[model samples]
Every structure is written in structure tokens, then in C-alpha cells.
Target: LEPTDQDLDVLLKNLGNLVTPMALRVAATLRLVDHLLAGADTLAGLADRTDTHPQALSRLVRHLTVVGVLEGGEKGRPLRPTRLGMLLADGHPAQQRAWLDLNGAVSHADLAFTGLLDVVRTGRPAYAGRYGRPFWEDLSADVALADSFDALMSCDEDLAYEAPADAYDWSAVRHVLDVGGGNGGMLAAIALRAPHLRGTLVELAGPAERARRRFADAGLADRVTVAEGDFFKPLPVTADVVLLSFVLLNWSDEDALTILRGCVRALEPGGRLLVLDRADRFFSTLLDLRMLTFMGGRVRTRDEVVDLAGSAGLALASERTSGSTTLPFDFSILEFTAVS
Candidate 1:
């Protein structure tokens, strides 16, 4: 019998309630799914291979079985993953493993939320206010944590990759510059879709190096120039189309304006700037809280975005929306131009 069928109401209420994260984290941390995939079917076999106590492994397996990640078993039947559980396999395209490990990596910072009352009073994030260090800084101090966080960011469904490529007319675009483009994912997508367009990517040196490698791997090295430096400084290329996809929401209003000003400054006369970002929606709202919690950033409202663009001496000429509620793409695309 399915656990949900037994207690549908309580299950809905407690779906992501604390114990679920714990179990998921524990299972992911021990690589239980990997072991299962490797054909360790019994508790004793799994325990021997994974260095866990047999009894404890049995308890965890029973719990996972009840929760539907694994199939229940007797002596004659070998334990196997349910269809949903296959997502946790090492090379699954769905990235279930990475998402789970992201939770585990940041789980410690979440503990700071226990002091939410103090943060609410002080107007600071519980993690930063209590720990005296920003969340990203904490991750930076730990190589593994920082790497995991980067992976999480990179794993975001690439929904925005196609949003700009398909939504706007790229035929007129001669040169495209993607400011703050990480690993050249979006630019690569755009260049692949529009062969007539030449691309340039600007990012800080660390990520810029990765971008170069990716472009080279994708055979776009000749078409896309990877410019390594701060985007706050003058941009390296003059272009007809400037892309700021998924960039602004990670910044404060003032900094976002500064970046916008740089984009406007780099635009050729009568040229256009394309901004892809999130707006009001469930995932966007939740992501906004995360930005606030970790980095003092917020998802801008449509009005706020217009104001920021105006402040940067750019005019919001047109806009449109794309993507779905389930993905992290409330994908609001704003096309802008320098103020006449």
C-alpha cells in the first residue's frame, strides 16, 4: 500500500516537513541509491559495502521502502528502486542527486533559521545575523560547499537559455554581448540558434575561464569571445544586442543600475539591450526570499525594473513572459534602448 493512500491529508501537510529532508539528506549522503544501483539488494550486503551498521541500514531501507523510493522486499525478493527513485542514480538527466546534495550542503546554514525571531527583530537574515558572515562567504570558505553551490546554480533547468533565443528576433543582431554570462550557457545557446550572430561573454576571471572551456567544447570559441573582467568596468565589446539574462535579480538595486548603465554605455547607437529576469510568481517569490535570506538581493517588480532601467538612462521599450510555474523561470524578458 502507498503511504499517501494511507494518510492523504497528513501526507500533504507534511510532504516537505522536516523529517523528509533528513531522510533524503541521510540517504544521499550515504550514497544509498548509488549502492542500490550497483546491485546491493539486501540490507546486509548494502551495509557491508557502504560501511553502515546492518540493523541501522535495515531501518533506513524500511523507511525508504515505505516512502516509495525503494520497493519492499523479502528474503526471496531483491530490493529495487521505484521509477521515481531512479532519478537519484549517478548520471540521471533530471539532476535529482545534485538537488538533494545541494540541500545537504546548505543544511547547516538552515540551522541558523532556528533563531528566526532574532533576525525578524534585527532585520537581518538568520544565517548572516547569527553567524556574522554572509551565506556565500561561508560557502567560499569551504571548497566543497562552494563547488556544490555552483553546481546547483548551473543545474537550473536552462529554461532561460531558450527564452531569449526564441522570444526575440535575432536576425537583425550582428554582434551580441552577454554581460555576467556564467559558463557561456546562454550565449552558446543563442549562437547555436542564430549562426549569423557573433557573441561575446564578459564575466569575472574565475567563471570566465570555465566559459572559455565550454565555448571551446561546444565549438563556439571562434564565434564567441570570452572577456574576463568585472562587468562594472567598461564593457569590452560594442554590440547591437546586449543580453543581461538572469543577472539583475542577484544584485541590489543600486548595483543592478550600475550594471545596466554599463550595458547602455556599451550599446551601439539605436541598438537594443535584452534583459531576462524573474517577476512575480510562486517560484520567483520563493527565489526572492532566498536572495533576501542569503545575499540581500530581491526579485524586482515590473515597475521597479522600469524605474531601474530609466535610472540607468535606458528606456524599457517592450517586454514579454515565458516558462512555467514548476521551473525557476518566471522568465520576464524586457527589451530596452538608450534614452533618446
Candidate 2:
């Protein structure tokens, strides 16, 4: 018999609240949507493949079906993902896990809700209240999390690795400086593209070790110099070109201005300062919010970045864009130059 028309009223809106995380996590772990590479279908089949329990998975699977990630299940039966879930297929995009790891430190730390006084009173980071350690200070102790964070940054660099160097004319650039570069991918990409140009990579101690290793892998050790220190303390001496890739978003406005001022001091008048990271509605900008939650920092708009640079005695020379947010771009890179 057909169900009564009024029977649909029992469907509760709160049903969605329970299912989204289950689905996002399940997809992340199983890479379920991606395993369709071999074209497997159906719940029993996917369970057997992913090693998840079929009976226990039914609840979330049914939930996902209702939300339209999957199809083929009427009630408790097996199902297959629809096109929308297909877009979310695991490993389909770089930094996919990193993107979802917003559940990583920030959210997990904030659930206590104990920082009300700090936020209400000071509008400052209660990161210690939540994490028991400052964000930058904890990088060395938690090797795994630090690696995850830096690895995510490197992955995002893949999008810009090939473009930023090629987009510009580098005939006069003899030496390039990567300031606060994490693992030296940006330096390697740009230096490799312009084989004659050498590089100097300035990064934190931990990331400097990593940047040295990355440069070695790219065979830039002989051509590139790796310096380990904080940018706030000092930077590599004057170079022909200075690149700030994915650095500014990690600090507050005042600190960002300080770092920009350091860049101006370290760079020569003719030397260019290229600032690359998320700006606009960039994927990285959105991703930067996750960082705000985690590190108590934020991604800045171009205007904010420009203002920061101006305060540091630098002016924007020119800007160039290679990709758009709607398609083919996970994060866009912006090259900002310091004017003499």
C-alpha cells in the first residue's frame, strides 16, 4: 500500500545534524567515493572492500541516501553514491584531508566552552586555554601535527609551483629569496623553472631542516642556501628577488606588519617581494579560516595586505593572476612586489 500523504510530516529536520559528519568522515577514511576507480557499487560490496561492518554502516548509509550522496537504497538496502558525492571523492583534490582536519585541533579544543572569559574580556587567543600550548610554540613538540600542517602547505603549493615562475619574465633575476618558506617547494619550483636563477630559503628551524631536505631532493642544495631563523628576528640579507609564500596569514595585523617591515629591510630597492597565498574568496582564504580557528590568525584581503606592506615602507608594484576560484583552482597565488 502507498504511504499516506501526511506520513511525510514525521521526517525530522534534525536528522541531518547527525549524518553529515558521519558521511564526511566515512568518505575521508574509506576514500569510498574514490574507490569507485574500479567501478564497484552497492553497500555490501563497498563494505567488503573497505572492511567496514555492513550492519553497523546501515544507519549512516541510509542517512547519506536521504541526503542524496547515494542512491539505490529504498530503506535499509545497499546504496551507491550520486554525482554530488562523486565530487567529494577522496584524494581527488590536493589537501583534501588537510581541508577536513579542521576537526584537527581547533574544534576539538574549543568544545570545552571554558574560554568565555578570555574571549569576552580580551578578544585575544585562548589557544593555550584550549590547546595547552601556543600554536607556533607547539610545532616542535608535536612532530606529527607539524608535519601534517606543513605537508598541507606544500600540497597547496603544487597549484602555484608551475605558474608563478613561468608567468613572469626572469631574465634579470639572478638570486631568489624564499622568506618564511616552509619546505622550499616554492623556491625549487621557481628556481627550477629558471635554471640560471639560484635561491636562498629562510624558514623556521624545524621547517628550515625540512626546506633543506626538499631543496636537496630538488637538487637545489648547491644552488640554494638554507637559513634557519625567525623572520621577526632577521631574514636572509638582500637578494634580487624575495618571495613570501604562505607566510603572512599566520600572524595578527600588527605582527603581519612587523614581518612585512622585516621583508622591506631585508630586500634591496630593485629587488621584488612576492607575497603568495590566499586573497579574495580564494580556496586558501576559506582554508585560512580554519587556521584562524586553530592558530588564532587569519587570511588577509589584498587591501589589508597592501596596507600592511605600505606601513612597512613598501608599495605594491603590480599584481598578476593565473587562475580563478570557480574552476581548476584550489588556491590562487598573488605576486606582490615592494616598490623602491
Candidate 3:
């Protein structure tokens, strides 16, 4: 058990295996699973549909079959997706395709890891080093990429919305403003939970339109409004409660304070601000590294959050922590009241 050459070689090889993962990502980016399901199963058919050289695609398909993502294709039979490969289909409930597509924001941002050495050396995000701009600016410059980000946020597995929607008392709150709300899921959850509540979502153009569609599709359009704008600027409306769900951690201290002050200015007198974010826990510590690499963001401790709120002219009224056994991370809801 201490030292076996075979075991050491196997372990190192497994740890160093990037080819399989890159192959899988390439297949996902090309929608190979969906194409097969749609009857483009032959090598020629898939190459034409995916717009790739037939010879190069033949090598990829062979590798996929060897990796168990595809089957058949022997002696001119059409290829078919294995059960595992179907998870990469766009319609799959897990929604893995959106996150795996290299053309999309999430996967594209992950490519920033190539600059991690520079990020660590300079204490700046790797995203800007690789993409020639900051993460948020990159999203703002490309509408489709921004929309991809919104879609990724709205995926069904993001059950973090449930904690804030259920943990807080919304019975007395008449108007709720969701600052930088992405795809309207958080606001929609609050509005659905408290039928008497009216909500507004403030976001950039891409997410704002997505939120409008989401609200209308959920039949909350009459009670919810989507305001397309930046949260760093003055908010368009004042409300009884302003929600900053999973927002602050994406910014530096100075920018976070600016956003909090803007929310403060937008709150009605005596209004409350609810901040829902990741708790200071083990998984969140790892996530912080990813944030640093991708967006120059950090996960704040509870006291750090309270101190930031205090500096922004708000006092912490209450706090609550929530998690489920099924999830790997926890969430905290910090309720703050505007101070005179």
C-alpha cells in the first residue's frame, strides 16, 4: 500500500487525464447527442449538421464510442447515443448541455483558468487576462453570451432560490425589488409564495427581457415589472424590501458598497434589505477560488457582510442560515433595516 509502481502510475494518469473531458466537452458543444436523437446518426450526417470536416469528426465519433457515449456505427450502422450521452441533450432535465457548451458563457469563462498563474501573481481575475476585458463587461458586450448566462442561472437545479423564498416572512411586505435579478427566478419565487406581493426585477437588457418573458409565462406579469438597467446606478423604483440574492459576492468591496448604497437610496423609509448569499462553508471556500479566477469575486463571511451593510447605512435586523441534506452548500439570509 505504501509504494507500488503500477498504482502510482495509474493514479497519476487518472489525475492527468484531460483528453476525455475535452472530448466530452467538444461533443457537448457540437450537440452530438441531440443530433443523433434528431436522426443525424451517420458520420456523414453528423459532420454535415455540425459543420465539421468528416475525417476529423470521424475521429471524434470513434473516440466517443470508445468512451461509451455512443454505440453502434459498426459496419456502416448509424451511431446512437448511449444513456450517459443523452444527458448532454438540450432537453435533458439536468440541463448539462448549457453548462458544457464551449460557446456559452459558463464554459467560455472556464477557459480563463489557462491564465491562473498570472492571476495568482497579479491578484487579478484570469478572465480579463484571457478575454481582454472583465467578466461583466464581456457579458455586456455580447447579447447572446449574456443570454446564455441568464439561461444557466435559471436552470432548475438552482434550488438556492427556495431558501430565501421560504425562510423570510413576506406577509407584511407589499412591494419587493430584486436587484440584479437574473432570469426573474428569485422574484418569481417570492411572488408565487406571497400572492399579495408585487415585485420588480432590475437587470441588464438581456436578463431583463428574459425576466419579462419568465414573469409572463408564470402569469405574474400583472404583479411584476422588469426594469432594464444597472444596479450600480440609481434604481428605478423604491420598495418595502430590496433583494440582493447571490449578487454581492460577484464584486469587490468598493463596488459592493456602491451597490448597497444604491439599494439604500432606492428603499422606502424604514424599508428592509434582504441579502441572500452563500454561507461561509467548505464548498464555498472552493467556489471562492473559481470566482477569483473567473470574475474577481469572493465569498464573504457573515461578519464581513454585516460590516459592509453597516458601512452602507443599514443595521442588521436578523439573520438565518439554511441548507438541505441533498445540497453540498448552505445559504444565509441577512435582513437589514435602513438606519437614520
Candidate 4:
């Protein structure tokens, strides 16, 4: 049925409303839910603990209550988080707070969407326009920003890493090289699953250090190694399997080809290259635009990926798709070998 005038008005208002999201981000940044759970239930108590002005904090709390994030804030009743608000807690497994924190790297990159108009007009990423540098360069320049970014990736909220760990057959592989692996989550997962396999992760400096620490914390230091380097150049190690999980989508076809060639060069003659990425779908279509806006990257279809890999002198041997109930899109793992 065609939309009525009132329906259009409601839809536009819902779509255009900025106040709700900003309020939620502010609440997350202030850790209001955590404070309430910790017994700072009164308005004055919340203001004191959060170091916010009482009147301003009261207004935020009132809006949150009206939006159903909190309840029982009226008539001197102590404020409490509703079920939806609980996801913002720091200890929540969903890890929503880390993504919503306005000061964090992920959210910082999200603000680049404001420059999408320029990206659309010029065919360049909006990140550099908004942040004064390209996305990777900006991360390299700011340590805190880089750290937040690594933490965000390591969270693995959508179980992105789990797919590759389970989908592939690693029993025959002696060593696995994870190219541009962030914080060694995928490597660690694979290593833990196959006790006999060893892992080597190649990443830039910031994520490299984090990966080293994570491997050590996971008691995998002896079985895994971390190499801090750029994948644009030649890779540092060779393995029976090279993994490019969720990495190619952040690059243009030319750059992705370069990275693929590097992986090919590092592979043993019979080595296999595994590429795990988001499949072309409705959700991935939206994410592809986000990748374009934020990092000048595009998601490729299975055939496009196969063709790109072929150009890198690799032939696709197998492919599998992994889906999760929590995620809207499926991730595909494509296995390739050097063309003889």
C-alpha cells in the first residue's frame, strides 16, 4: 500500500532524529547505566559520580527515561536501567558501550559519514576529508585512537572470527599466517581449535603489539608469533595457509590485488590462501558504502573475488558461507592456491 502523509511524516521523523542517538552515546560515554547499577541511583549521585552538571545530567536522564533506556526516574524515584539499557554496561557480553563511546575510534570514524557528500562527489574516502588524514594514517598518528580501534576489532561481537576457525580444515596445515590480523583473535581461535597448529600474525605496529600481548595472555606465546609490518610490502613469513579474514573489504581492487599477490609470494608452493569476507547482500551493500565512505574499500561478490584472486595468480579451490543468527549478513571463506 502507498504511504499516507501522516505515515511519511512519521517515517521521516524517525529516520532524521539525531537527538536519540546522540543522547544514547552521551549516556554510554558517561557510563550512566554502570553508575546506576553501582548504587548511584539518585540524580545528584549520578551527577557527582559522572562529574556532570546536575541540571544537564537530569535532562539527559529524563530523555533516556522517555526513550525507554531507563525507568522510574520521576517523583524522586531512583533511576534504573531497563533491559535495553543493560547492554550499555561495561561488562555486558554484547560490548555495545565500546562501539557507542563517542570518544572512541570506531565512533570517531563513524562521524566521517558527515563528509559522505564529498565522497560521493569526488569518489574519495570521507575520512581523510573529515579527520585531516587518511584513516590508517590517522590511526598511526594517535596511539589512543589506534588502541581503541584494536579493542573494537578484538571484541568480535558478530563472531566474525569464529566462522573461519570452524569453516576451514586446518588439521593438515602446519603453520597459519594471518595477514593483517587484528590483535590475533582469529589466529588464537584457530590455534586453540587445532592444538598442533602454529600461528604467525602480520599486522602494523599498534595492532601487532596488542596481538603479542593477547597471545601471551591467552598462553599462546610459545605456539604463536607476531610480526609487526605492512602487508602492502612483501609479507615476512611463509606458511601452509595464509588467512586474509575480513581484510580485503577495506581496500580498493588495486590495493587488494597487491595484498593478494604478496600473500601469494609468501605462500609455500602448495600453500593455500583463505579469504574471509562479507558476502554481497542487503546488509553488506550498506556496509560496502560505509567502507567506501570511511576507508575507500568495497565489498566484492564471490565471482569478483575469484576473478581478483585469479589476477593475483591464484585459483579458487573451494568456498563456504558462514551465517550467524545475530548478524544480518553471511561471511564467505574462499580458498585459493597459486596457479601452477
Task: List TM-score per model, in order.
Answer: 0.68, 0.66, 0.75, 0.76
Q: For residues 1-340, what per-residue lDDT tens digits would candidate 1 score against the true structure?
A: 5566648767654654666666766776677789888978888878998798888778888878877788857747888788888877878976667667634445455556566566457545666765677664565455566556666663344553665567777776889999988767778878888788899898765557778988899888878888876788999888999998778876777778888899999999999998877755676656665665555567788889998899999888999987754445456789988997
TM-score: which is higher, 2 or 3? 3
**Whole-model lDDT for model 1 versus the true structure?**
0.75
Model 4, range 5-105, lDDT digits (tens) per residue? Answer: 98887766566676787888889889999999999889999999989999998899898998889998677577999999999999997678878887788
Q: What's every prediction's RMSD, in angstroms?
A: 6.1, 6.9, 4.5, 4.3
Cα lDDT of all candidates, in order? Answer: 0.75, 0.66, 0.85, 0.85
Model 3 agreement with the true structure over 1-340: per-residue lDDT tens digits: 4969987877665656667767888898999999999988789999999999999988988988987889988956779999898889989977788887898888888778778888788767898878898887788778778877767653334564776678888889999999988778778888888899999898877667778988999899999999888888899999999999888998878889999999999899888999988755765655677788888778899999999999999999999998854345677899999988
Deviation from native of the Cα of residue 95 in model 4, angstroms: 3.7
The alpha-carbon lDDT assigned to residue 312 of candidate 3 equals: 98
- Span of ten consecutive residues with least summed lDDT in model 1: 151-160
Question: What TM-score does structure 1 among the candidates reach?
Answer: 0.68
Residue 288 of model 4: what lDDT?
A: 73
- 1 or 2: which has the higher TM-score? 1
Per-residue accuracy of model 2 over 106-214 as CA lDDT, tens digit each: 3233332346455446545566677787666666456665665555444444544666555677677888878877777768878777778878887667777878888
The 10-residue segment of model 2 with minimum total lDDT is: 104-113
Model 4: residues with Cα > 4 Å off, grouped in runs:
1-5, 37-45, 58-62, 70-93, 132-163, 166-175, 189-199, 214-224, 237-240, 279-286, 322-331
